Ligand binder design. Sequence first.
Ligand code: NA
Ligand code: NA
Lengths: 188, 184
Amino acid sequence: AEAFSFSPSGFKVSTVESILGGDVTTTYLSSSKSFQKDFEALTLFINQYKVEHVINPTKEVSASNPESYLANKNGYVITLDISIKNNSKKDKMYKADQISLLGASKSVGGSLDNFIPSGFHLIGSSSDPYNFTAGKTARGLLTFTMDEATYNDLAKDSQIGVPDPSRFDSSSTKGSSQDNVVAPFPIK
Amino acid sequence: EAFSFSPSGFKVSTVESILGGDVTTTYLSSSKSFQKDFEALTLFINQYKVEHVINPTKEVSASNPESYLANKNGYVITLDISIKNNSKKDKMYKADQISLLGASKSVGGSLDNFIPSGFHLIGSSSDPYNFTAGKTARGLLTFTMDEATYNDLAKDSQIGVPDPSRFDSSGSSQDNVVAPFPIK
Ligand code: NA
Ligand code: NA
C-alpha cells in the first residue's frame, strides 16, 4: 500500500511520518469494528484505529500548526476511522472533536484535523461539516495527539468518552438527559 | 439554618428547598481533596456532598433544568470549588465543562442547578467565566443525574477537569486532569 485510504491496507500508511519524519512505528492496530453506539438518531461506529509512536522527529512543521506539538519531542498519535450514520429523516448536529480518550490521570481531546489528509475528514454535509444529512453515513478520521508520559498514563484500561448527540440538538433542554458513553478503548 | 461555606453550613440542602421530597446526604467530603496548578489558574475542591432525591414534591418550572428531577428520583452532587488566578492578566475558565467520569457514563457540570443565591462561582463582575488577576473565586458546581447514572458513576468515579488553555485564545499541550472522586 502506497497511499493512505480507508481500506485495510491503505489505513496502515503513515500520514504522521509524512508530516513529522523521525522514527515512526505502529505499536497497536485494531482493524475490525470495535464500537457501535445507537443514540436517538445517530449511530457512531469505530471502524478501525491505529496507535503510532513517534520518536526523534526530524521534519519542519509550522510552529503554529497543532501538529507541531510532536515536531520537537517524542509522542503518540492515535488515529480512528469512524462513521456516523443518521437514521433520522432530519439532519442532526454532531461535533466528533468533543470525543476524548480517558486515562488514569489525564485525558486527551480529539481532533478532526491533526494528521488527517484532505479527502479523509469527517464531514456531515457541505453546508456544515458538523451537520449530518438525514439518512446518510459520513466516514472520516479523528486523531488524538500526546506525549510519551500521556500515552503511558492511558496505556492500561483507557476509555473513550463519546458525548450524546443531544448536547448539540437545540430541542434538547436538559443536560442530564444526555446519555454520554464511556467505553473501553485499549491502545496497547 | 442557612447555607454557607462552613462545615455545617455546607450541609444545608439547597436541593431539598427546590425539590421537596425526601433528600438525604449519602456521602460528604468536608476537607480539601483536589488541587491542580495549571499555567495561570489553580483549581481547588474544598468539599463536596452527594444527595439522593426521592419522590420530589415541589413544582419546578419546566424551562428550568432543575426540573429534570421534578418527577423522578435522582442524585445531585454539589462541589465547593475555588479558582485562583496567579497571572497578572484576567483568564477565562468554564467550570461547567468539568465532568464526572463513571464506569460507563459521564455527566457534565452546571454552575446554575441547585445553587443558592450568593454562592455561584463568579470569576468577575464582567463575566462569570472571566477570572480576575490575583484573585480567588469560590462557589458551587453541581452534577444532576438519575439513579442508574449515579450507580454507574459510583462504581468507578473520577472527575475530569479541563486545562484552562482550551479557553485561552492565544491543543495537545493541554494538561487535562482526571482525578479520583469517590462518591460513596
Ligand atoms: Na481513568
Ligand atoms: Na470512571
